[PDB]
Amino acid sequence: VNSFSGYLKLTDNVYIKNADIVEEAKKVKPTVVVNAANVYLKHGGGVAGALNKATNNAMQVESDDYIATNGPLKVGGSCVLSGHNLAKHCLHVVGPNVNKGEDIQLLKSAYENFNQHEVLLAPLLSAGIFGADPIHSLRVCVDTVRTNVYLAVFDKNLYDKLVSSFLE
Numbered sequence: 015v016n017s018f019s020g021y022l023k024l025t026d027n028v029y030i031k032n033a034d035i036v037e038e039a040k041k042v043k044p045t046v047v048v049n050a051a052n053v054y055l056k057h058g059g060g061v062a063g064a065l066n067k068a069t070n071n072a073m074q075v076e077s078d079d080y081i082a083t084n085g086p087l088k089v090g091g092s093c094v095l096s097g098h099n100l101a102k103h104c105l106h107v108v109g110p111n112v113n114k115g116e117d118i119q120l121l122k123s124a125y126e127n128f129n130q131h132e133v134l135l136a137p138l139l140s141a142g143i144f145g146a147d148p149i150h151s152l153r154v155c156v157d158t159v160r161t162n163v164y165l166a167v168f169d170k171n172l173y174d175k176l177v178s179s180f181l182e
């Protein structure tokens with residue numbers, strides 16, 4: 015199904031909408047919803063916290079089982095877990111947290127994980143508390159992702175700046 019609506023096509027494979035990813039996931043129930051995760055899969059605040067709260071903590075208990083059995087992810091890495099009631103799968107992806115000294119070169123490695131799935135609903139990696147420049151994150155996405163990605167950005171002001179900079 016992947017019934018995405020109201021998106022603006024930026025490139026052949028990148029679409030963008032001013033929307034809350036949790037709300038989009040509920041309506042669309044996409045095959046894959048991306049989580050802006052940390053290496054230990056602790057979904058305490060922001061986007062990760064909101065996705066986890068929408069599953070009524072079922073994603074946190076699953077992530078905890080994953081970590082105990084497989085160990086933490088590396089910055090730029092990912093893992094595929096259940097999407098619970100939000101999606102068929104959740105692709106947890108760790109972008110660099112530049113506010114904590116992590117390499118911005120790893121933002122390319124993080125978006126590369128998207129290429130293992132045909133269609134994904136995702137947030138802007140490394141934006142918000144992670145400290146990366148959001149327009150730079152969208153540029154890395156556009157150059158790196160080759161599969162079909164629907165980006166939800168929950169801030170009209172930021173959405174407008176992104177669309178203006180892209181001029182598309």
Ligand SMILES: CCNC(=O)c1cc2c(N[C@H](c3ccc4c(c3)S(=O)(=O)NCC4)C(C)C)ncnc2[nH]1
Binds near residue numbers: 062140143167168169
């Ligand atoms: C009301 C429930 N939903 C939310 O809180 C929510 C928030 C939200 C959202 N926020 C964006 C965003 C993008 C990436 C990151 C963050 C925040 S963070 O939480 O600071 N962690 C680092 C990675 C900002 C830039 C506008 N984007 C898309 N959908 C959303 N939904």
